[PDB]
Design a protein around this ligand. Structure first.
Ligand SMILES: Nc1ncnc2c1ncn2[C@@H]1O[C@H](COP(=O)(O)OP(=O)(O)O)[C@@H](O)[C@H]1O
Ligand SMILES: [Mg+2]
Lengths: 56, 66, 371, 56, 188
């Protein structure tokens, strides 16, 4: 019984850790992807600016 | 007619340029340096988390190894 | 009170209160019913998404424009678009605001009469007035003469005006516009392997056309250069990945404007219908029209068109006249800015078609003195 | 016995998974910071350009 | 298939009652490998994978590389002679049949359900496979709730508890008027 209680508690703690880590990963992923899209957009508008310079 | 072209063109010919320059300056100042500093801070915290994870993993592997 | 300067257009509805610089709400004019079945219950699924809402759910809709070439082909959808524009994008009830619609030249009468009948019966406005889309674009430039080429998305028309006196016998209306360029681009993209068929993917091809295409200064030299080097191939990322590379399709899509034989149209390009429109005018106002050629409308926003057109007209015109092409940076909203200016005038305040006048003469009042 | 075997086994899986998750988290965060720093370097390139534009 | 590959060590289960024992073995021991060839190489050199299990009468058995070979059939249906592609590629094919504008949302909201998706380590193998197949820009996310087994029934309870749904039932008088073929009609 003692071993069972300790094991179950350790398991539950680790499980909740797992869930929270997943949520953190998701949020950081969303922010990083938004930054990535921002970077692609800035580079593309930069190139458009370069081509505008080429025009004039 | 053709006398409002001055009052609708010359205005934004300078005010718009100056205001957009001001906006770019303030946005760059607010954004870039703070973002780099915050990323460095988060990196240091991440390294500390890595050290804590290594210590805990090693001590648990030491005890549990049977 | 303030007047509502609506501008139906064909492709983008632009509206806003009179007296400002830019339209308050600009959104595509598409009404798309859902086409699949739908299994989730209580999701709150509507029967028709209009305006900018149907450009976000376009994956499961069948978008269909209610205005084909200037004329309106589906009156129920157009009524829905107007209702949305008044109530949700501006949030002003029409019972307390005059309206100033815009209409292309040489359009069928029944279209205009039905438009005024709707505005007076369904929305019940106090007074509405219909104006030709080119005179407004001439207002916005602050000129009083000049020949304006208003190449919209539905129809391209070329109205010459001198000293405020329009020349009704010199209006050259051509039905090539942005939509035909979108279809031709969608048709020549198939030469590399990319097939766009669905009415939703027409929007993607339109975005490609807007962001990448440009008008070549000299067509044959560009065709030769794009066939040897690879400095032109610009890539573009679809809404799901799988980037595509556009080669000499870049300047071949908008070249259709100057050679309408590409899409099988007989008529001459926009570079030669302007010269023909000038030559129909009297011999003493041709210099002023040559010097004050005005560009407007969305489709004239291609990078490098104000030079190609000037080169072409200078080739056609006599060598002594000076050819100047006015291309303001606010080209897209030029018609609406002009509409705002016209609605803000005090001299114009008595030209509205008051409701009691409509009650006495019926919808045919629009063709009468109140034009 | 069945219960505690199950619990310890699934807990071990949890520990290995969570450690893999932590490696993933650190790699993602550091890559995010590197990309953000590249972006800020680009922003300061643009800011030098804006200082030039102070010519207007 | 597990009952068929267990015979390679000497354990023969034939009776329809022993299929239940093989099912219990599959539930308690099998797991999906993140990379198949590396696991096949590791299990053939070391012995860190061999997990033992006690039959309903004693005589413990030791499962070697049968652990991750049984559920690997999902991603390579050629093992049991089926022609079709695995569950990692029929999802991508099902996505590609959809319209071009809703593929990003489907990529980001891939949902797992059902009992068989409870193998330890499947939500990572499937994500790796789809990320290999899909374009590099899209984000691939696999929703694997802990209550996977009863997901269908929980959803059924939610649907039956809705007020908007209360008039969609096939009332008995309607069946009496149109016969059993009423189900294909508007009341789906
Ligand atoms: N920046 C741009 N570059 C190239 N083409 C454009 C651009 N913006 C709009 N267009 C084209 O012009 C059309 C919009 O024209 P618009 O002036 O709104 O028509 P309308 O006269 O009906 O308002 C779009 O369909 C698009 O094809
Ligand atoms: Mg227009």
């Amino acid at each position: 019984s003692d071993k069972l209680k300790e094991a179950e508690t350790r398991a539950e703690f680790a499980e909740r850790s797992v869930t929270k880590l997943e949520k953190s990963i998701d949020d950081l992923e969303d922010e990083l992807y938004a930054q990535k899209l921002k970077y692609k957009a800035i580079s593309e508008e930069l190139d458009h600016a370069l081509n505008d310079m080429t025009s004039i | 007619d053709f006398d409002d072209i001055h009052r609708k063109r010359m205005e934004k010919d300078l005010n718009e340029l100056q205001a957009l320059i001001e906006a770019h300056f303030e946005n760059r100042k607010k954004e870039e340096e703070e973002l780099v500093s915050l990323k460095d801070r988060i990196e240091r915290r991440r390294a500390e988390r890595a050290e804590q994870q290594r210590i805990r993993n090693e001590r648990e592997k030491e005890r549990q190894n049977r | 009170t303030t007047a509502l300067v609506c501008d139906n257009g064909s492709g983008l509805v632009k509206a806003g209160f009179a007296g400002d610089d830019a339209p308050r709400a600009v959104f595509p004019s598409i009404v798309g019913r859902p086409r699949h079945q739908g299994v989730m219950v209580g999701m709150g699924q509507k029967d028709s998404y209009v305006g900018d809402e149907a450009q976000s759910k376009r994956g499961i809709l069948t978008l269909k424009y209610p205005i084909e070439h200037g004329i309106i082909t589906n009156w129920d959808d157009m009524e829905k678009i107007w209702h949305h524009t008044f109530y949700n994008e501006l949030r002003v009830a029409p019972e307390e605001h005059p309206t100033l619609l815009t209409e292309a030249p040489l359009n069928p009468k029944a279209n205009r009469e039905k438009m005024t009948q709707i505005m007076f019966e369904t929305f019940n406005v106090p007074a509405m007035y219909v104006a030709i889309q080119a005179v407004l674009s001439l207002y916005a430039s602050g000129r009083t003469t000049g020949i304006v080429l208003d190449s919209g998305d539905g129809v391209t028309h070329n109205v010459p005006i001198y000293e405020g006196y329009a020349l009704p016998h010199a209006i050259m209306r051509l039905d090539l516009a942005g939509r035909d360029l979108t279809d031709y681009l969608m048709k020549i993209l198939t030469e590399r392997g990319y097939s766009f068929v669905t009415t939703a993917e027409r929007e993607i091809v339109r975005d490609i056309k807007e962001k990448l295409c440009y008008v070549a200064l000299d067509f044959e030299n560009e065709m030769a250069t794009a066939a040897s080097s690879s400095s032109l191939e610009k890539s573009y990322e679809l809404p799901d990945g799988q980037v595509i590379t556009i080669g000499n399709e870049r300047f071949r899509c908008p070249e259709t404007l100057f050679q309408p034989s590409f899409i099988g149209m007989e008529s001459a390009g926009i570079h030669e219908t302007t010269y023909n429109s000038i030559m129909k005018c009297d011999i003493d106002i041709r210099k002023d029209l040559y010097a004050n050629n005005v560009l407007s409308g969305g489709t004239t926003m291609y990078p490098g068109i104000a030079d190609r057109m000037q080169k072409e007209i200078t080739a056609l015109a006599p060598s002594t006249m000076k050819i100047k092409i006015i291309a303001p940076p606010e080209r897209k909203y030029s018609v609406w800015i002009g509409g705002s200016i016209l609605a803000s005038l005090s001299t114009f305040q008595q030209m509205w078609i008051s409701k009691q006048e409509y009650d006495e003469a019926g919808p045919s009042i629009v063709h009468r003195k109140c034009f």
